[model samples]
Target chain A: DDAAIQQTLAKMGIKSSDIQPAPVAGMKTVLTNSGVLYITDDGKHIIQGPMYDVSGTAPVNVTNKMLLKQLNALEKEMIVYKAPQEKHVITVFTDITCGYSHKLHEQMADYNALGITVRYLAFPRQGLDSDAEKEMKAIWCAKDKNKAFDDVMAGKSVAPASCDVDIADHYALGVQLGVSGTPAVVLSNGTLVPGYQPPKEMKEFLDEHQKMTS
Target chain B: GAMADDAAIQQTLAKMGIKSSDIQPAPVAGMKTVLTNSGVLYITDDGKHIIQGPMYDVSGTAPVNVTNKMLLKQLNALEKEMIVYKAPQEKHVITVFTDITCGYSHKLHEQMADYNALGITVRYLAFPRQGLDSDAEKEMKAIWCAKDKNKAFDDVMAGKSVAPASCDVDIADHYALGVQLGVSGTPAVVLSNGTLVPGYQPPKEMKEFLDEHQKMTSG
Candidate 1:
């Protein structure tokens, strides 16, 4: 729905809804918030309830875990302009054109006041070849990139053909890391947090993640 | 095909591991050309090209996968065409698939009289230039359903025109046989012993093939 939710999944060629409750018993399951499930192994056949049991742990859906890994890899490879101070860095793969993406960006101040950093990772939901990619390129190309991003999020129309060459370079870098969309975030040790959470909720999740790593 | 054009011979001599410019005008028949690495070139016709990728079969180990299978299908198609010319001669006979598109096929066709003279009849299978689908297969099918099988074959050998028949379905019945025989590529000479001679070799070398087959068959 927001830049965080949609772009993160899109980058991995997956959607939150695509994660489905695996059919096998003795496995915890739920349909992903974005609806993508079922991947092909050999040409046409689809495997059901494909999960991996981490040793001494409950059977984990390995496919979903791999998707998370991919999302994390993408964020680590993103070209970060800067990481704001006193900010809880919620790196998101975002398409400028998406409604929810703008909503997430607009609430950056609210997030910052609460010691959250709204780190942006370019996931142009429309794809590198689409209008969203062009808009992102233009936003980065503007003399004042931060203000330009702010303006675009404020719903100003950015021209399509703005400094395409530089944007293309940025896009190529994304492609090398296998990024497929926006709003994907990566922690220092590469745990990927895909999608948006409310300010209070995001703090709790990040704290838990930090504890696990520590 | 003339083994190599005078100029190509000269060029070959120039680039030789050893040199001898005694490359004279070798007056050979049937599509005078040189099987060059770059292409199949007609030396007499100003470097005019005939074919490309005429790879010699790398024998002993497993045969080349893709090209070998393609050759098998083509050979099967050619055999089907030769069915019309497949006179019930009743005598011991061997079928040979010849690609007019291939130099070895012409060599085999030219030597047919020698096999006939030996009381061993040799039948001709036609595989044309345009692959299993186009003129290659159509020509083969016409030869298969010809009114006079032998005459149709003669027409093909003599470079006469044969129209495609209405019943010419694109099928390779020999593929089944190929599977059994492991036959891949053209000029594959199947002896009465069921042994396959894979590529173009001289008549003297072929005698060893016949002898080997004789040993296997009688055993």
Candidate 2:
């Protein structure tokens, strides 16, 4: 039975092992190098964009929910810049080369003060083999990841180090979540806030989401 | 059943200030998609609300692009109305949503002979991209109204302004059809099999693309 799905996926350049049931009914989601794709169980048809559930508690993103387990599994790998008084946690897919990511990183203190814990996951703007990945690998492999990340974002060079860090896996994880650009902030509820937001705006966004969900 | 469907569509469109004549069954069950003068819209079976986004059917091997299916339905209906440049030994015909002012459309237009040589007939649909009441719209209307439309189109592409003519030709209808088909820019090409290619391609590249597409669909 799985063989049929496997064979169909192979033609689309995706592996059967990566196929998982989507949150949306009757669809299966695949984690491809390009991005997440929604395919039928038979694997004949495909949907390449986002899907939403307007009938949910609010306008819930069915695609985002599909990535929840994957995001949770990689939680330990994220380089977290925790707030002293943490109230909300947001996982942000970031790249050092991205100006918006730099802008978001700059406001980390402001975010922290507002009780927003920011977690960073490496998403090199260029593919895994590029300079952005190399620097991200260095940050991930560093003894003081927080300090190293800050230094790199500030336009300073850091000693390159290699470790057991799977930065490529982190990048793949971002792709699996359909992250096309950097500064992709993901709220705890699996709602992806796609771009850079000022600390005040971000707080308001979380507050509004919290209000709706609560 | 048809009367109820029409009533629902009319009720929904009336709320949005759109008056539609075409209300066809959508790809999905319990959905009626309307091709309006304003644009394409979806009304539920009950016609209580309108959906402005893509619809999907997840029952097939891949998520069936139901919206594309609806677009194909609308395109098929409008096929006879298009300004066709038929290839003598026609192998393929592509309906292209185009604008006269768009450089990419002009580039594609200039290669019409190469396209014809490849047995690909080009059908033109006016999509000014500037919306109604603009220079592009006026020019598109003029071309559509011209006694010799194909010649007028050639003259406009050659950077010459032909004398304005008015007729029963509704370039606005063509423009709305483009919008209904989700065309945001010029030179948006739709193959016979309802495959939409959103940008410009040279004749050789277009041939290769169409060949591959036909091969995949057939084989």
Candidate 3:
């Protein structure tokens, strides 16, 4: 019967494999490139929003667990700007076109000085093959990637280049991880702090998250 | 299980300025979400607490939302209260929230023939996007108050002004219902099954959507 439910969702454009049990009875959660959607098992209803676990001692974000797993799979693909003595590593899904991503990049040194290693994954907000994606791909393919990255973040033009690098895969990865916008920060423990967070506030979040995990 | 008395829930919510009719059984086992004129709310079964955020189920791959069940039920219950445009064959029914001044609402009105031809009955409910006090509300009220309400609605949507008229119809209630059901724009279509499709879509696309929805639900 669940298989039928999965098939029903598949007919509606969601992959069968992506459909999984939602916390509620008679409901299924489907992970998509756009975001997560919860549907009735009969596929009669679809809800577009987040789910929470109020049953726990304290509410637990079970959705974050899946996001963490998806992000972990792309650990090797991320462009690293490591801190010399890295204490905390945060993965950021960024777009070159986003002003907030630019704001976050401007404070890159502050983040590094706080012992945060900034691992970047491209999430060109505009769909694949656009100017934003092209710029991001060129930056990823550049020989001097870090310098090119800084220059681009500083509002400077990029030198066009071609290589075997597939930034498109990174963009797809971002989407798979439910990143709809740029500067989506994922903390070390797979907790997604969506949108821009200043260096100081990010430090507080990292510390609090570390304490919670510990 | 100790359930709060409906009298208690009514009294407690009334003090907070919410009507008893706005309260319903939530999907959660022991909690309920309330639909106030202001927005959505959550209350404990005992009527002691009110929460202002989402509830989730964590038993799946991710949290699955079960909030829309109550909203759908509430929307369905209002079916008879709607100003209906019944199809000749009466195959499918769709409830819509409309504003007289909105461009998309006018566009949807123009395609009434195509929708009616597909055996899709279009029902109208007032949703003046510019708030209850705006000129659109006045226009909507006048139409609802007209002797020939259907013709009045058509005339107003066609840019012809109607004479000011007043009656017992509370257009504000429809606007409030739209807000509770998450209808932010004009021409918000609710299918026979209570799935909300916001904004304007062509008749062909609407038919395809209806067909696909039927297939998914029935298959």
Candidate 4:
């Protein structure tokens, strides 16, 4: 695929120099002379090249890199209101009622002591439009951040979370990004690592993937 | 003027713009030896010519395009038939394609009174899970052909057997429509707003869908 790709470069208005092979999750990586095209092949028909949203003054190609870049950017902007003690930032989309989520929240102190900042987002396992949506809403409705965290972990009832958000708009943010499950962790590089990780395993993964690049 | 029995084939050929002094038989058996219209045509020995479908490329673009077009045609036709079943001046309408076999479909159907009581009208379209020629089609025909079509549908949905009737009109046509509408499975729901819900939804859950739609169109 690489050799044949080199031959098709001139026709695609690109050179071997401009082309970069992208290994994106759940996408077929095609290294063309023009650029690396990440494709989703349903069957026989293959959609060629990257998709760009051209509804702006300047066209925005919603590439795999762009989505990852968005994830990284969102993580930074939304994860600031987490814990008082500044620690390592690990961005995660979480469901309120998830068993593993409860477990992770129970062990939040151990992770915090180890300098880990666990940032949370609304990822209702029952999906954005479900009753779990109400639970996600409740998290944002608590009187204070610590109270919200405590109420969720304690299994005490929380009120429905409305659109008025203090923490990077978790309800809208989660829905827009297609988050259907809880405890979906996204790395700094935009690669998603779903499910809850115990403090020890999470720290190891964080250390191992500290400088991991796409 | 109508052609005589002897001159019928020739007249039809002339109308189709086929011009030839002489024609001979083809290689295919039970088909006409004569040629006409677009090209060489295979006809039965008695002179009836049944089209052998389209010529397709096993490894080319024609099959894909043709299949896509065929599916689109089927879906368009099916959507047209569903227009008749729409509730007059209703608040909300949902076209549900169901199979009598599944439990979720039954639950949804059993809750039909509750749905209608809430002013959410439910109209059904047949999709025999066992396919066109199966016992499911016979069962479906019985439901649609019942003395009271709607009540019979309720009975079948409630797990009661139905008596078969021949009055089920264009059932095969509806099946073709389901294929066109991209339905490969049963219990597919098309909401009043043309937003298709692919499976069974509880009354409580369905309320959200109705509410969203009502907010959008009911000014």
| Residue A198 miss distance in model 2 (angstroms) | 2.7
Among all windows of 10 consecutive residues in model 1 chain A, the one with the lowest summed lDDT is A39-48
Give the TM-score of each candidate.
0.32, 0.82, 0.68, 0.38
Candidate 2: Cα lDDT at B183: 81
Tens digit of lDDT per residue, candidate 1, span B27-77?
Answer: 222113233222222222222211112222212122222223333433544
lDDT of 2 by residue, A3-70 (tens): 66677667545673477776544456677666666555655445564555443334456666767887
Residue B147, model 4, lDDT: 67
**Candidate 1 local Cα displacement, residue B132, angstroms:** 46
- lDDT per residue for candidate 3 within B1-219, as digits (tens), equals 224445555655766556544666665544556677766665555555444433443333323334543566766666655677777876677889998899999999898888888888899988999999899889888888787778888788776987788878778888877877668998999766555678998878887888877776565
lDDT of 3 by residue, A56-109 (tens): 334445555556666776676677888777889999989999999999988988
Off by more than 4 A, model 3: A1-9, A16-30, A37-49, A55-60, A84-89, A141-144, A154-178, A188-194, A197-214, B1-80, B86-92, B111-120, B130-139, B160-168, B171-182, B201-219
Error of 4 at A67 (Å): 4.4
Error of 4 at B37 (Å): 36
TM-scores, chain B, all models:
0.50, 0.82, 0.80, 0.57
Question: Looking at model 2 chain A, which ten-residue stretch has the lowest summed lDDT?
Answer: A49-58
Predicted complex 1: CAPRI docking category? incorrect
The lowest-lDDT stretch of 10 consecutive residues in candidate 3 chain A is A49-58
Q: Give DockQ for candidates 1 onward, in order.
A: 0.00, 0.12, 0.07, 0.01
Select the stronger candidate by lDDT from 1 and 4: 4
lDDT of 4 by residue, A145-168 (tens): 457767767878766656455333
Ten consecutive residues with minimal summed lDDT in candidate 1 chain B?
A: B49-58
Stretches off by above 4 angstroms in model 1 are A1-87, A159-182, B1-219
Task: Give the winner by DockQ.
Answer: 2
Off by over 4 Å in 4: A1-89, A95-99, A109-117, A122-165, A199-214, B1-71, B76-96, B102-155, B161-219
